[PDB]
């Protein structure tokens, strides 16, 4: 499923990400744009043999099981495929755990480079929230 920005903002708001762990809704929308381009089915291989899955490009080296990353941990205790569903519940739940690891939203390389310190409210501006 490819979300529109206001549709994703609405979904992320219902799922409780607005100001979750100190990050306003705009941060989560911006992160999803620069990670997956709002595509829940996005998959990207990393050079270490791991893969990034879904709307928030959650990595198989630490968070999910894809059965092809030797040395993987599965900290969100889920198959990586569950992060590819049209419903964002599993990706939101694993993101809530990731943001609580030592790096905050810097765990998302793209959020750090492209979103951090910018006008992130622009990503929810115009949406009837």
């Amino acid at each position: 499923k490819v979300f529109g920005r206001c549709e994703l903002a609405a979904a992320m708001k219902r799922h409780g990400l607005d100001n979750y762990r100190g990050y306003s809704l705009g941060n989560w929308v911006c992160a999803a744009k620069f990670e997956s381009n709002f595509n829940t089915q996005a998959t990207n291989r990393n050079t270490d043999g791991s893969t990034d899955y879904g709307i928030l490009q959650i990595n198989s080296r630490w968070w999910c099981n894809d059965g092809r990353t030797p040395g993987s941990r599965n900290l969100c205790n889920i198959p990586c495929s569950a992060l590819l569903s049209s419903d964002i519940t599993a990706s939101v739940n694993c993101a809530k755990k990731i943001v609580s690891d030592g790096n905050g939203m810097n765990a998302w390389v793209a959020w750090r480079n492209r979103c951090k310190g910018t006008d992130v409210q622009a990503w929810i501006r115009g949406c009837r929230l």
């Epitope: 100190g22 306003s24 790096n103 810097n106 390389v109 750090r112 480079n113 492209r114 310190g117």
Partner: antibody, heavy 117, light 112 residues
Framework: QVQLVESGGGLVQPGGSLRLSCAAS????????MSWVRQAPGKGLEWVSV???????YYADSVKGRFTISRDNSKNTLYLQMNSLRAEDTAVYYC???????????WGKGTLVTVSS | QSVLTQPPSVSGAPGQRVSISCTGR?????????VHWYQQLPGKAPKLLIY???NRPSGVPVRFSGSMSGTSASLAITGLQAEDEADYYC???????????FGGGTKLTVLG
């Protein structure tokens, strides 16, 4: 127009405490990413601490537990409370405003903090 | 200034193309965290020179350019000028340290 003015710097004894202040104008400190960067005389830049727009705080391992970054909305000021100050904490302390990807947009002029007996 | 390393000094001649390397690791540049660059003139606070590996803020001359590849970054000065004599600092983010990191700094000298 955007301004960062540090104060509260000076001489303190080891094990002593000092509170740095950074009065800002041209923006809301509560809506920005603010950091402290220090520089020992004739040495390189060393990142100290940061406060996010949403309030998350992070510290260098060298200042962890001893230093506390904070901000007051009423006064539009960023603070650096330093405890158990040691000789090696002697440096020029810069208040800093972050831009995209923790890049630093604006710096203050710096305030000298000398930790000596 | 240990997880990012720079040469302590770089010396160039007027008009020379010189570069200042920033050597990182898998926990910073290697992870994909962008490199920022600062120029620090004598007795002054540093000023942002390059952001997000390659972007120049307004007022920064076109002779300054940045590049990133693998675990290292590079600050390039094409047509070196006497006014470029300063201390240069690379900066990134390190996931192992959970914060911003600076390189050790490079003293640039213009000889002529």
């Amino acid at each position: 127009q955007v301004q960062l003015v540090e104060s509260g710097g000076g001489l303190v004894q080891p094990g002593g405490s000092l509170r740095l202040s950074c009065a800002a104008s041209g923006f809301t400190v509560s809506s920005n990413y603010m950091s402290w960067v220090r520089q020992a005389p004739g040495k390189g830049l060393e990142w100290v601490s940061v406060i996010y727009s949403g309030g998350s705080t992070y510290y260098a391992d060298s200042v962890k537990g001893r230093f506390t970054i904070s901000r007051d909305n009423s006064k539009n000021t960023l603070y650096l409370q330093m405890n158990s100050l040691r000789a090696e904490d002697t440096a020029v302390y810069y208040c800093a405003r972050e831009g995209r990807g923790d890049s630093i947009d604006y710096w203050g002029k710096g305030t000298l903090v000398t930790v000596s007996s | 200034q240990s997880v990012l390393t720079q040469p302590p000094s770089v010396s160039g001649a007027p008009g020379q193309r010189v570069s200042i390397s920033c050597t990182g690791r898998s926990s910073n540049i290697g992870a994909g965290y962008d490199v920022h660059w600062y120029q620090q003139l004598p007795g002054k606070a540093p000023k942002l020179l390059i952001y997000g590996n390659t972007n120049r803020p307004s007022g920064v001359p076109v002779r300054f350019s940045g590049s990133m590849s693998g675990t290292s970054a590079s600050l390039a000065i094409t047509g070196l000028q006497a006014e470029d004599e300063a201390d240069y600092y690379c900066q990134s983010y390190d996931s192992s340290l959970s914060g911003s990191v600076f390189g050790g700094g490079t003293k640039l000298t213009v000889l002529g």
